[PDB]
Amino acid sequence: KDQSSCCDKEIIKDVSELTGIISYNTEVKRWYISVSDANSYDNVTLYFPCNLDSKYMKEKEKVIFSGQISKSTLKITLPAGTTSYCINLMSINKIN
């Protein structure tokens, strides 16, 4: 817990033990974790980790993760009901 966040901006909150799928965004040239909301058809949240181990940088890698989320000033083109955050990962594990 004696660790500083890699995100530039103020931590909003922590996300805990979320299930997501890793992909690479070719516009911003970054890896992210996509978490789909079971509440609706279009609500997806993308978490862009600034401390992701390169062993997870594989298309469609399924992980369970926790971390500190912040807003990011990253300019990214996303559909209407898709939002994104910077994340300082505190835990991440591959799902088998």
Residue ranges in contact with Ni ion by CB under 5 A: 1-2
C-beta of 5: minimal distance to Ni ion in Å? 12
Q: Take residue 42 and report the two structure tokens written for it.
A: 């279009």
| Residue 24, beta-bridge partner list | 31
Nearer to Ni ion, 1 or 55 (CB): 1
Nearer to Ni ion, 68 or 72 (CB): 68
Nearer to Ni ion, 21 or 90 (CB): 90
C-beta of 25: minimal distance to Ni ion in Å? 30
| Residue 49, beta-bridge partner list | 87
| CA atoms of 13 and 54, how far apart (whole Å) | 25
Angle at alpha carbon of residue 75, lines to 72 and 79, rounded to 5°:
100
C-beta of 9: minimal distance to Ni ion in Å? 21
